[PDB]
Design a protein around this ligand. Structure first.
Ligand SMILES: Cc1cc2nc3c(=O)[nH]c(=O)nc-3n(C[C@H](O)[C@H](O)[C@H](O)COP(=O)(O)OP(=O)(O)OC[C@H]3O[C@@H](n4cnc5c(N)ncnc54)[C@H](O)[C@@H]3O)c2cc1C
Ligand SMILES: Cc1cc2nc3c(=O)[nH]c(=O)nc-3n(C[C@H](O)[C@H](O)[C@H](O)COP(=O)(O)OP(=O)(O)OC[C@H]3O[C@@H](n4cnc5c(N)ncnc54)[C@H](O)[C@@H]3O)c2cc1C
Ligand SMILES: Cc1cc2nc3c(=O)[nH]c(=O)nc-3n(C[C@H](O)[C@H](O)[C@H](O)COP(=O)(O)OP(=O)(O)OC[C@H]3O[C@@H](n4cnc5c(N)ncnc54)[C@H](O)[C@@H]3O)c2cc1C
Ligand SMILES: Cc1cc2nc3c(=O)[nH]c(=O)nc-3n(C[C@H](O)[C@H](O)[C@H](O)COP(=O)(O)OP(=O)(O)OC[C@H]3O[C@@H](n4cnc5c(N)ncnc54)[C@H](O)[C@@H]3O)c2cc1C
Ligand SMILES: NC(=O)c1ccc[n+]([C@@H]2O[C@H](COP(=O)([O-])OP(=O)(O)OC[C@H]3O[C@@H](n4cnc5c(N)ncnc54)[C@H](OP(=O)(O)O)[C@@H]3O)[C@@H](O)[C@H]2O)c1
Ligand SMILES: NC(=O)c1ccc[n+]([C@@H]2O[C@H](COP(=O)([O-])OP(=O)(O)OC[C@H]3O[C@@H](n4cnc5c(N)ncnc54)[C@H](OP(=O)(O)O)[C@@H]3O)[C@@H](O)[C@H]2O)c1
Lengths: 323, 323, 322, 323
């Protein structure tokens, strides 16, 4: 088999940042990525614009420079590839880590391709692989998506969006521009404070001109092949519907996390993996986490801007264990 | 059942142009589309730029205006949606025509959703849905694609492209820019004259700088999961390979075309469906074809520029039969 | 000379709009344009993005379509040309109108290139060409601009913006992106309500991060070649400064409008030419106005979305006079 | 009055690169730029796309990364600003060097604002500031430009282009798309070999479809207020004309170069300042040149790709002369 000093599961922005900082402290590292690098960003909608400025998304001391104020999807894809190029990062792409076991101060990593042995382990798997479950009658129909890519095919179609945060509002804007009849169904009372303040004005003007239907205090009770039923303050309504976008968020792969021996503790910000807030080391010795995997479900506490700093913290703790 | 005067199978540019012109002659028409309108363009590579100027792609008195010299994908998607909006065209989306049978002087169309009765039938299904068969050992592996979408996931991967016309060179440029190691194997002797003269210089420069491996007179003999074997002037060569893009063209759904009763004619123009060159009517009475489906093999005779004129021709012939 | 039935002064969106609807009613027209068509849009900042949708700017039987939600400066340029191409409009470019005198029931039009005599006249000259005067010492210095174009050359320069409307806010964001040290000096108390609610948060965040200096209740008192002096509730402050953008708004060429015999107003909500509202005809018979030149009395503003609809109202009034 | 070790006249790509490389060897440098940094690039047409790839334009180890194949004008502006930011370069902008004289072991530099004294001088002023002389009757009229910016104001105007290289061909394409009536007058016999091979097809197709007038072997003899008279192999023609674009090239400020005491040596392939090819030092001790100002004799073309390496070579020569 292969023996490397450190292995990092996940080649996202926070995973890449973890390998760069470990390499800067003289630790030979290998990233194993289920797809290719920044697969999460690659899976954004094709039109997506980041909400951060491009400099705040930069890692490794490679400047992220874009004429525009905020960068789009593909611009980040080009950047992070150059980040891997510049730091000469070892990246085993299209390989899925399936099992991690610790044996006498060593890890045994079993993937889809090879078997690995390492001293240090860093899990930066994010949460985008596991979408929250809808739990309404009809939620498993093929007309229900939890991911948004493009809006053109839904031209002149009756579309319902479940959710109220940035994914829902973003998709509604793109779906309206493509000729779809968009009905957003949010359970809250007012707009979520997490919708960024420069996007909501363009959405509110559309609901004022009666181009997009917005409904508050709305919970979806039934989804059929061609209808959607939702209740507002008790009153049930049923409308024709062709597709449903369940933008209800994501959550980490807790099944994988417990199978290595990591505990879920639940605390201030919620159900999160147990880790030392000063070193990001988990309850399992020599196993660290990095990225949005440390926040839990809450998709507003940790993002790319602050998750990229975990690598520098992990690098210090690993170099310390070298007595 | 539903009874409409005319039905058009396919909502591509030539299908839309056919429906516009029939409506101009007072013919009630219905488009049945397997996906949504201009699904072909929607399935282009994401970065794709058209070879034609935007005026040449315009149909049914709706001007196609783009600040750019040549229009990109999405821009055509936005345009053709506005064409459907402007001309009030009936488009039953996500419905696939499965069976056509002639009874008396009327057609019985059976789809995935409904059954229809019409007098005139127009088949404009194109050829993009059916890729040419490779016919080499290993062609059925999941690592072999006949369609190109994006190049980022193949970053730092060993990629081989089979083909030599515009699809191959476009994919090679995008794959080279995304950091892949590209090797183009062409069975021809020199560059195909059908490569647009403003794209090829960008390709040959990278070949001269040895950034893209180009092989002429090369035929692929075997594809494994991680090698590709090809012969050059008799010499067999084997290189490591991660993915294969078989850009070997497409062909019409001849099975569906024979299942309605339309003849395939072995002509010295590239084997094409049987139709009257002056009206585009097939051997079946009141059944027409439109678009690139009339060129059969050669994907270089008919494109959007001249295929959009089929609609005007069919409308005259149908108006001659009156009603 | 030349004699045309109707002549229109100005080739902006509303000048083009009035020509189309008069032609639809069978009125032969000629557009006399100081520059070329939509000179105003051409003289936007190079980066500029409209705040309207792409179809609220569309005129006369030509759809305006863009893959983006809001079109940019260059896309409108390409569009409004194609509108002229589609409608076969007669436009005389680089020809400024200098004198209009009403003799008989006709007009004699004196331009920089020929003499014209016409029955119907439309003055659609807008306001973007005549900038409000600054009224501070040093306003005539070469370091003082009333137009923003690009931000690059002011990289690592000390810049000051006078005003607080969308013009001042847009130019500040662009100059910050280009690395300039920007100080916005506004005479008002809070943020102008006319700032687009999707633009303000970007300017707000930069100010709080101390990337852009924002001083409310600020009045500029002096401009030297290397400083700018401004008072904030009486307290004077003087800072090093390399360039100045007086984004203090604009006003129509009223001097020209009176010189033909059209009265002004200055009533409560502003100041406007006299027009019938129902025909847009002025006190001068057979003399019409169109565009943002008509704003001033109404409590609402005039953009391209509304002002473009004036050409239709004018066409009926001219068709009524036959 | 002000004393710095080294001064660089010109803040273009090659000037900026020279200051970075000198700073890498511990030399205190000051750039004096008539406008701001890369003013030459700033004065391109607003649409201009580079013919080099973005990697080849990179300097002072700051990567120039752009999603697209080739970088456009503004994108280079954004990049080079970040280069000055990243290296912290002293850039006295809007200052024009008027006089340079050698005294003792010092130079006395007189600008528009201050006076400077330095040991090492590097002149990297380029050529884009001083246009070649037209030498036909009417060349000083306001309707005659030697610089192209945008094409919209010339919509539906009669425009004549003098020249035959990329500047002329680029301007012809941009002016045609804006509705101008373009006549190109080239004193050559065939298309210039310096036109890029991926642009000539686009220009070729417009000439063959009679949308642009192309006239070889044409020399302009007179420019009037609204006509232009030109002879082709002696035969004179006169056409109506509203504006004239004299794309007849540019040349360095040789007068400024001779006024400091550097010899300009005429030869074949053009005329260049005299300098040692291994240090780029002129006949004046401690006076160097950098950038495209160095081309002329050596029979080689200079662009940003190769001009950016002068700084590293000059830095060695300045370091060899010690302190
Ligand atoms: C539309 C959209 C826009 C956004 N915009 C912004 C923005 O502007 N700014 C910002 O800061 N954040 C933004 N985000 C959030 C951003 O995507 C996350 O903060 C970020 O992706 C988290 O990075 P990560 O490295 O922690 O994990 P991820 O980015 O999710 O990547 C983890 C990687 O691990 C891989 N992986 C998963 N399971 C396995 C396994 N078993 N074996 C091997 N590999 C595995 C995945 O394929 C993936 O490549 C946006 C998100 C979305 C959806
Ligand atoms: C990358 C790329 C770039 C191209 N660039 C250009 C260019 O610049 N200029 C140009 O002129 N051409 C270009 N083409 C070619 C262009 O795609 C075709 O010429 C054009 O799409 C033909 O239109 P059509 O209406 O005849 O058929 P299509 O556009 O192929 O559409 C036929 C439609 O019928 C539908 N359909 C198929 N079977 C059924 C069924 N059984 N029931 C119902 N619906 C069905 C399909 O889903 C499809 O939507 C390009 C092609 C590619 C792949
Ligand atoms: C940065 C910026 C952004 C804007 N964004 C928007 C937006 O998103 N939406 C919107 O609706 N509006 C917008 N506007 C305002 C818009 O420019 C005006 O509403 C519009 O120009 C009015 O059109 P008009 O035809 O009435 O006048 P103009 O567009 O100004 O055109 C009048 C024409 O007359 C010519 N002319 C002037 N004087 C004379 C003379 N004496 N003789 C001959 N010709 C003359 C001028 O050169 C000009 O070509 C914006 C303005 C600015 C500065
Ligand atoms: C339309 C166009 C497209 C081009 N595309 C490309 C391309 O794709 N790739 C490529 O490699 N090249 C390209 N070029 C060429 C490129 O512009 C030059 O090769 C490059 O700018 C040379 O840089 P430089 O530093 O040598 O001098 P420059 O950058 O040209 O000029 C040096 C600076 O000195 C300043 N200066 C002048 N006189 C004084 C003075 N007295 N005091 C102080 N400062 C002064 C000037 O303002 C200028 O900014 C293109 C040129 C044009 C016109
Ligand atoms: N602008 C952008 O660039 C952009 C766009 C999309 C996403 N993102 C990023 O994407 C990440 C998260 O992706 P996301 O937006 O899909 O997730 P998210 O931010 O967690 O959104 C969750 C949404 O789903 C609702 N929801 C949660 N559980 C639900 C349940 N069981 N039933 C019904 N509704 C439920 C939430 O309700 P509550 O509001 O009551 O919690 C909220 O509306 C964040 O980091 C976010 O910033 C950014
Ligand atoms: N620039 C763009 O926007 C763009 C990009 C892609 C496609 N297109 C258009 O799409 C259409 C189809 O183009 P295409 O290139 O996909 O198809 P195509 O025109 O049929 O070209 C097929 C290519 O594959 C080769 N080939 C065919 N069968 C093969 C086999 N069995 N084994 C090996 N090689 C084989 C062909 O060889 P031969 O040369 O000997 O025939 C040719 O090089 C055309 O209209 C094209 O212009 C446009």
């Amino acid at each position: 088999m292969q023996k490397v000093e450190s292995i990092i599961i996940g080649g996202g922005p926070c995973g890449l940042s973890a390998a760069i900082e470990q390499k800067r402290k003289g630790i030979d590292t290998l990233i194993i990525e289920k797809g290719n690098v920044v697969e999460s960003i690659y899976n954004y909608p094709t039109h997506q614009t980041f909400f951060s400025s491009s400099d705040k998304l930069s890692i490794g001391d490679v400047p992220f420079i874009v004429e525009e104020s905020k960068p789009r999807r593909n611009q980040a894809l080009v950047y992070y590839r150059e980040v891997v190029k510049h730091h000469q990062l070892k990246v085993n792409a299209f390989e899925e880590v399936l099992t991690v076991k610790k044996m006498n101060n060593k890890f045994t990593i079993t993937t889809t391709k090879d078997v690995y042995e390492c001293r240090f382990l860093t899990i930066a798997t994010g949460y985008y692989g596991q979408h929250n479950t809808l739990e309404v009658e009809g939620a498993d129909l093929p007309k229900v998506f939890h991911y948004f890519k493009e809006a053109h095919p839904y031209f002149d179609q009756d579309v319902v969006i479940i959710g109220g945060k940035n994914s829902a509002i973003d998709a509604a804007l793109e779906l309206e521009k493509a000729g779809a009849n968009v009905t957003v169904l949010y359970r809250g009372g007012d707009y979520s404070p997490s919708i960024k303040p420069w996007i909501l004005p363009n959405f509110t003007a559309l609901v004022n001109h009666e181009k997009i239907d917005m409904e508050f205090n709305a919970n979806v009770t039934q989804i059929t092949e061609d209808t959607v039923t939702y209740e507002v303050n008790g009153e049930s309504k049923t409308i024709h519907n062709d597709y449903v976008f369940a933008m209800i968020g994501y959550h980490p792969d807790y099944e994988f996390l417990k199978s290595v021996g990591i505990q879920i503790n639940t605390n201030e910000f919620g159900t999160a993996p147990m880790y030392n807030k000063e070193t990001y080391e988990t309850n399992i010795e020599n196993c660290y986490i990095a990225g949005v995997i440390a926040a839990g479900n809450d998709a507003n506490t940790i993002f790319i801007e602050n998750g990229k700093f975990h690598g520098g913290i992990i690098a210090q703790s690993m170099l310390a264990k070298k007595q």
